[PDB]
Design an enzyme around this catalytic site. Structure first.
Site, PDB file in Angstrom:
ATOM      1  N   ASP B  33       0.824  -1.198   0.000  1.00 18.57           N
ATOM      2  CA  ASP B  33       0.000   0.000   0.000  1.00 18.57           C
ATOM      3  C   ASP B  33       0.865   1.257   0.000  1.00 18.57           C
ATOM      4  O   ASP B  33       2.096   1.189  -0.010  1.00 18.57           O
ATOM      5  CB  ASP B  33      -1.059   0.023   1.135  1.00 18.57           C
ATOM      6  CG  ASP B  33      -0.477  -0.147   2.513  1.00 18.57           C
ATOM      7  OD1 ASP B  33       0.689   0.240   2.731  1.00 18.57           O
ATOM      8  OD2 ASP B  33      -1.216  -0.651   3.395  1.00 18.57           O
ATOM      9  N   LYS B  53      -4.678   2.920  -1.442  1.00 17.67           N
ATOM     10  CA  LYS B  53      -5.580   4.036  -1.676  1.00 17.67           C
ATOM     11  C   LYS B  53      -5.196   5.167  -0.756  1.00 17.67           C
ATOM     12  O   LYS B  53      -4.382   5.011   0.151  1.00 17.67           O
ATOM     13  CB  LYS B  53      -7.026   3.632  -1.344  1.00 17.67           C
ATOM     14  CG  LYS B  53      -7.250   3.366   0.154  1.00 17.67           C
ATOM     15  CD  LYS B  53      -8.631   2.796   0.466  1.00 17.67           C
ATOM     16  CE  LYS B  53      -9.670   3.886   0.677  1.00 17.67           C
ATOM     17  NZ  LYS B  53     -11.013   3.297   0.961  1.00 17.67           N
ATOM     18  N   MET B 155      -1.470  10.228  11.264  1.00 17.58           N
ATOM     19  CA  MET B 155      -2.205  10.942  10.223  1.00 17.58           C
ATOM     20  C   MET B 155      -2.905  12.191  10.775  1.00 17.58           C
ATOM     21  O   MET B 155      -4.014  12.530  10.345  1.00 17.58           O
ATOM     22  CB  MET B 155      -3.247  10.011   9.614  1.00 17.58           C
ATOM     23  CG  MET B 155      -2.649   8.851   8.828  1.00 17.58           C
ATOM     24  SD  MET B 155      -1.823   9.476   7.359  1.00 17.58           S
ATOM     25  CE  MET B 155      -3.248   9.845   6.338  1.00 17.58           C
TER      26      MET B 155
END
Ligand SMILES: [Cl-]
Ligand SMILES: [Cl-]
Ligand SMILES: [Cl-]
Lengths: 227, 221
Positions: B33, B53, B155
Site C-alpha cells: 500500500d 488508496k 495521520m
C-alpha cells in the site's frame, strides 16, 4: 561505550527486527531481563547477563566494552521502565541507541482498530512501578483496550471497568504466552472476568472490545483465522 | 494460495522483522500500500503491485483475491504493523470469507517510531493511539481518548488544528507539551515541539507525514 536498548519482540525469534538480530549476533555482552524468550537469547553467542541496582549493573558492562546490548521484551519503550534506564544512562554519559520492537500489544494478530468497531486503541498496565493500581478512568471507554500485567488483578480490573461503564457483555480475550508454543487463548465476556470465573495465568495479554470477534465465523464459534 | 499480511515497519528497513524480510525476499508478488517505505520495497525482487488508496477498498479486496489465487503465496505489505490503522482487519476478513488462507506477521508500529518512552513512572501508566483520518476520510470522535496521559496521533498533521481544538474542548490540558516527529524513521526525520495551545492556534508548522505524541513524557527526553 554505547548501549543499544533493544526490543526482543513478543517471543517468536522470527519477530526480532533485522537490527536487533545483528546486534545480538555481534554483541560482546547481552544484558537481558525476565521478559526475554529463550529462543532469542540462544541466538546470541556473546556474554549473557540476566539484569537502581539494575541501572548500576548496566553501567559497569557498558564501560567494559565498545558497546553492549540491553534486551527487553516487546518494544523497550512501553511498559518496561525503558525510560528510566535511558535517563540513568544518559546522566552517566553513556550513549544510548533505542531499537524499537514488535510490542506484545500486537502479538495477537487481531485488528486493534477496525472499521465500525474501533478507530483507535489504548494500552494500560494493571501494576504500576511501586506495586500500585492503575487509574483506569481515562482508559475505561476506549473502543479497544489492551491490558498488560492485568492477570493477577483481573477481577478488580474487570469490576472497575464495569463500574466505569464498559459493557458487561463485551467480548474479551486473554492470550497467555503469546507468540510462543505455549500460547493459550482464553475467551470471556467482561462480566465473567469480574465474576471471578476465568482461569488465566501470567504472563498474558488481555484485549477487550468487539474486535475480539472480528474473525469468528457467523455460522458457528469457529476462529476462521486460526484454521 | 496463501496471503501473508506483513508489517513493513515505520520506514527503516532494519526495523523489518526477520520473518517479514524472509517473505519479502522470496515472494513472487508483493502487494504494497501507499505508506510502505521505498527502502523496504527495494528489497523485494518479485513482482511489486501497488494495491492501496488514499482515503476504493472493495477494489483493493478484489485485487488481493486475484493475485492470491494466481500464486502459491503472495505478500501483502503494509506500513508499520498491518493490524492497526490500515484496514488490515477488513482485508483479512474478506480473504477468509473467500477461503484464502491468511497469516499475519506483526511489525514495528509507527506509534513506536520515535524511540521515546510512551509510558514512564509518575507520568503515564498507559497510552492511547488514534488516527486523524478514518476509513473514508472521516474525522475521529476523540472523546474516548481525550484524557489518556500519553496520546499518540497518526495521520494528524493535516487536521492538527481541529484535533488540538477538539482535545481542548474535551478537557485536555492547554499547556501540555507535544511533539511532532516529522518523517520518523528516515534520514529526513525532524522534530518539532509545541504546547497543545500552539497547535490549536495554528502556530505550529509541520508537513506530513509525522508522528504526534502528546503528554508529559515528551519532556522526559
Ligand atoms: Cl512491549
Ligand atoms: Cl477461577
Ligand atoms: Cl502502524
Amino acid at each position: 561505550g554505547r548501549v543499544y536498548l533493544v526490543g526482543a519482540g513478543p517471543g517468536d525469534p522470527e519477530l526480532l527486527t533485522l537490527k536487533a538480530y545483528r546486534l545480538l549476533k555481534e554483541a560482546p555482552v547481552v544484558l537481558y531481563d525476565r521478559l526475554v524468550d529463550e529462543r532469542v537469547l540462544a541466538l546470541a553467542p556473546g556474554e549473557k547477563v540476566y539484569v537502581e541496582e539494575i541501572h548500576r549493573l548496566l553501567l559497569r558492562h557498558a564501560r567494559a566494552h565498545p558497546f553492549v546490548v540491553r534486551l527487553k521484551g516487546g518494544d523497550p519503550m512501553v511498559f518496561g521502565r525503558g525510560g528510566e534506564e535511558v535517563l540513568f544512562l544518559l546522566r552517566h554519559g553513556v550513549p544510548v541507541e533505542v531499537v524499537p520492537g514488535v510490542t506484545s500489544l500486537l502479538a495477537s494478530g487481531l485488528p486493534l482498530t477496525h472499521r465500525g468497531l474501533a478507530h483507535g486503541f489504548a494500552a494500560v498496565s494493571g501494576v504500576l512501578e511501586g506495586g500500585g493500581y492503575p487509574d483506569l478512568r481515562p482508559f475505561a471507554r476506549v473502543p479497544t483496550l489492551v491490558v498488560l500485567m492485568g492477570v493477577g488483578r483481573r477481577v478488580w480490573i474487570a469490576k472497575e471497568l464495569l463500574r466505569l461503564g464498559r459493557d458487561p457483555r463485551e467480548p474479551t480475550l486473554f492470550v497467555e504466552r503469546a507468540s510462543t508454543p505455549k500460547e493459550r487463548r482464553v475467551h470471556a465476556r467482561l462480566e465473567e472476568v469480574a465474576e471471578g470465573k476465568v482461569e488465566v495465568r501470567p504472563p498474558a495479554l488481555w484485549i477487550l472490545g468487539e474486535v475480539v470477534r472480528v474473525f469468528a465465523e457467523k455460522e458457528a464459534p469457529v476462529d476462521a483465522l486460526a484454521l
